[PDB]
Structure formats: structure tokens, C-alpha cells
Amino acid sequence: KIQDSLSSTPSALGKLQDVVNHNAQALNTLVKQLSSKFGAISSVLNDI
Amino acid sequence: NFNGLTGTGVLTESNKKFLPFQQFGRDIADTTDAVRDPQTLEILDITPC
């Protein structure tokens, strides 16, 4: 019945999924922060 | 260099469908991704080194 329980319930492996989910949005925010002007004329060094 | 868009990278053929009133393309960085030639009317693609 272990195989049936694993194949039926789709949220049994939730602890392992959070570990890999928390390590993607961190990089996503770290790369999205590059579009902030930080109180400057522009966010592009070449333009400045 | 395209009308004051200094940069560095390779230029390659692109198949993006720009609109007549559109000229530039962007990924999510506020950084240029696709540019259109001034003299000829064809869409280029920019990829870093």
C-alpha cells in the first residue's frame, strides 16, 4: 500500500520540494533586482 | 552601436516578429535583447560573449 499511497497523494513529498523551490526564487529576485534604478538616472551603465 | 546603444556581444539572424511601431526588445533585466538596424529594416539578435 506504500506505492498506492505515494501514487495517489500528490503532496506526500512536500518537504523535499520546498528545498528546491526556495533556491530558485532567491536567484530570481537576485536577478530581477538588476532593473532597479536605486535613485539614479538609469539602470544601464552604458547609457550613463 | 545602434543610435547610441554601445555594447558588446555577437550579432546573429533573428526571427522575432516586431511590429511597425516597435523597435527594441527586452528580457527581464531592463537590458536590450533585440535591436533593429537603422539603414536596412531587419531584426537582429544580441547574445553576450
Side-chain angles (χ1 to χ4, degrees):
Chain A
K1 303 192 295 183
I2 302 306
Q3 212 157 11
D4 302 334
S5 67
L6 293 175
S7 77
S8 285
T9 296
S11 71
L13 267 72
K15 291 208 208 173
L16 297 192
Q17 192 79 62
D18 274 18
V19 163
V20 302
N21 276 4
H22 291 181
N23 290 296
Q25 64 159 298
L27 276 297
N28 281 343
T29 59
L30 196 68
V31 74
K32 284 208 198 82
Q33 275 287 326
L34 274 163
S35 80
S36 298
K37 292 203 289 182
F38 280 112
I41 320 173
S42 291
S43 186
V44 175
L45 297 190
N46 309 312
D47 189 293
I48 292 187
Chain B
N1 188 323
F2 301 92
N3 302 318
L5 277 296
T6 59
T8 294
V10 298
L11 300 161
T12 176
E13 271 315 327
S14 170
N15 60 5
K16 292 176 182 174
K17 314 154 185 42
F18 279 1
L19 284 189
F21 76 100
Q22 273 155 354
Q23 187 174 1
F24 275 53
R26 276 195 173 137
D27 55 341
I28 61 170
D30 263 4
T31 59
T32 307
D33 195 11
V35 74
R36 149 177 290 181
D37 193 270
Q39 264 152 16
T40 181
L41 280 196
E42 193 283 348
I43 318 300
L44 320 181
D45 212 350
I46 287 179
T47 284
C49 312

